[PDB]
Design a protein around this ligand. Structure first.
Ligand SMILES: O=C(COP(=O)(O)O)[C@@H](O)[C@@H](O)[C@H](O)COP(=O)(O)O
Ligand SMILES: O=C(COP(=O)(O)O)[C@@H](O)[C@@H](O)[C@H](O)COP(=O)(O)O
Ligand code: NA
Ligand code: NA
Ligand SMILES: [Zn+2]
Ligand SMILES: [Zn+2]
Ligand SMILES: [Zn+2]
Ligand SMILES: [Zn+2]
Lengths: 293, 293
């Protein structure tokens, strides 16, 4: 059912596994994510960016998720505002029925990040909603700042900057994350931690995109082994979007290429869903949330 | 608001205009149809085939439409089961919250078509739901059968076969509809009538699809003049699906062609929605439902 984000991530935190947090922008993405969680017996963090909310309308974002939760009532599901940029955005999401919100104030200095995060926390906690915040920028996180930040804000989960970035082009050179920094943040905060920009661009997904004529020149994701190490170091929420988009659109491109007369939307989007679903299933197994319901 | 199908079509019947009945299979199609109705101040007949229902799940089909109706509460909206094939399918749609159902038993002899239609009508009317049925096969409708069929079944609207067929390949030669037969059916039945297979494949939609590298293989739709003539003859519900699909997928193909690196779903489907929306807006104006709310 639909639950406070902390309910899912406190369990992941105590038991030492990661829960993928999967972005969606429409029905097909959402359906594939839920079918993956059903088939792997995994809790689900469903998240929507501000741009996805603008695209769907917040009433449809929440409404579709509530329908899906009722279709799969045995699955723990949190609905999360990804990278909220203002207090007002977070409050709108709380009012609309989100059960988790992120405020990203990491571009501010410590004191202003802490003040704004604390304001969001007060509002969200009064409504029974969990909160995520972010600290560090690609300076990386200062673990002693993280300790104080968490204690004074009462934020439920923290995204510490340790070297990732969003999108398909994460590293110009070799992938590198600061796992010593991660472990220190974890030791000092003892709360669930969040990894942003955690897509891997799996080889089979890349191959499908390229086979269909797509271009991923220069792309580099987070290696599977880095994701596993991140979870071993205390990451409990793993933000995943790019992988889902590439797998989905690879299949759309393939259908377009192989039949110029095909215009039934279902013929494009059923194989697209299947590819997205399979990415999510494999990721749930990798992060350790499979068979946790 | 969400209303019985007869609420919309009795008005169109008495005032002599046509209401497009627009198919959807997902959020993007539905959103574009609604935005068109809002922009043209037109009532909305939203319909879902059995295949679309299998694809979305009937809970999501109804749920998304209810969200959209609450977003645009001033628009009359009916939610219609298109080409229901069994009593049980029609009953499932009634129970899930459809406000109109079609039973297609036109492949049966008159007596069996009447028997099955009457059984659906009894069930649907007991639930406050309107019913569509079909008579004739591409042998065309017998107007005296239509008269008796409507009188005995109490069906709310009738699809009389006058020469259309579904899909892009309607006429292996010159377009032709039996308007004399249409007028006789209308005179004898005095109820709202339905035109199936009513896509036009407009020149600009064909051009967009071909520019995007698609192939329509000699497809020909119902000319705009024939649609207008059919409304003048008493057609009040105009089933439209192919035109929407072609316009939508043309834009998906175009994005895929022009940027091989693009995999943001919204970048494919925002222009696709726009193209679908414009087809619907133009069709509402053509059929006479614009500025009728
Ligand atoms: O960290 C993430 C994904 O990491 P990755 O790119 O590695 O999948 C997410 O929190 C966000 O980046 C999200 O994807 C942004 O979505 P839009 O603003 O709608 O384009
Ligand atoms: O008459 C119609 C549209 O005519 P046109 O093809 O001219 O748009 C519709 O009632 C049906 O044909 C409907 O489109 C079938 O949908 P699926 O079974 O989901 O493929
Ligand atoms: Na987030
Ligand atoms: Na119909
Ligand atoms: Zn992020
Ligand atoms: Zn971030
Ligand atoms: Zn039809
Ligand atoms: Zn038919």
């Amino acid at each position: 059912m639909l639950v406070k984000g902390n309910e899912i991530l406190l369990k992941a935190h105590k038991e030492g596994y990661g829960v993928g947090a999967f972005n969606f922008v429409n029905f097909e993405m959402l359906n594939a994510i839920f079918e993956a969680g059903n088939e792997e017996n995994s809790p689900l963090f469903i998240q929507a960016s501000e741009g996805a909310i603008k695209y769907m309308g917040i009433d449809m974002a929440v409404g579709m998720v509530k329908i899906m939760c009722e279709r799969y009532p045995h699955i723990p599901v949190a609905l999360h505002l990804d990278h909220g940029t203002t207090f007002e955005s977070c409050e709108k999401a709380v009012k609309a029925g989100f059960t988790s919100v992120m405020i990203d104030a990491s571009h501010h200095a410590f004191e202003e990040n802490l003040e704004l995060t604390s304001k969001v926390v007060k509002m969200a906690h009064n409504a029974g909603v969990s909160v995520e915040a972010e600290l560090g920028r690609l300076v990386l996180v200062n673990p002693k700042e993280a300790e104080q930040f968490v204690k004074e804000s009462q934020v439920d989960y923290l995204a510490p900057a340790i070297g990732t970035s969003q999108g398909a082009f994460k590293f110009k050179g070799e992938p590198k994350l600061d796992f010593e920094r991660l472990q220190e943040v974890k030791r000092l905060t003892n709360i669930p931690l969040v990894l942003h920009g955690a897509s891997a661009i799996p080889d089979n997904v890349r191959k499908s995109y390229l086979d269909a004529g797509g271009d991923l020149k220069g792309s580099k994701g987070v290696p599977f082994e880095f994701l596993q190490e991140s979870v071993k170091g205390g990451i409990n929420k793993v933000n995943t979007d790019t992988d889902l988009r590439i797998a989905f659109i690879a299949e759309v491109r393939k259908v377009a290429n192989e039949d110029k007369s095909q215009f039934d939307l279902r013929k494009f989007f059923s194989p697209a869903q299947l590819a997205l679903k399979n990415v999510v299933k494999e990721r749930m197994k990798l992060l350790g949330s499979a068979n946790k319901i």
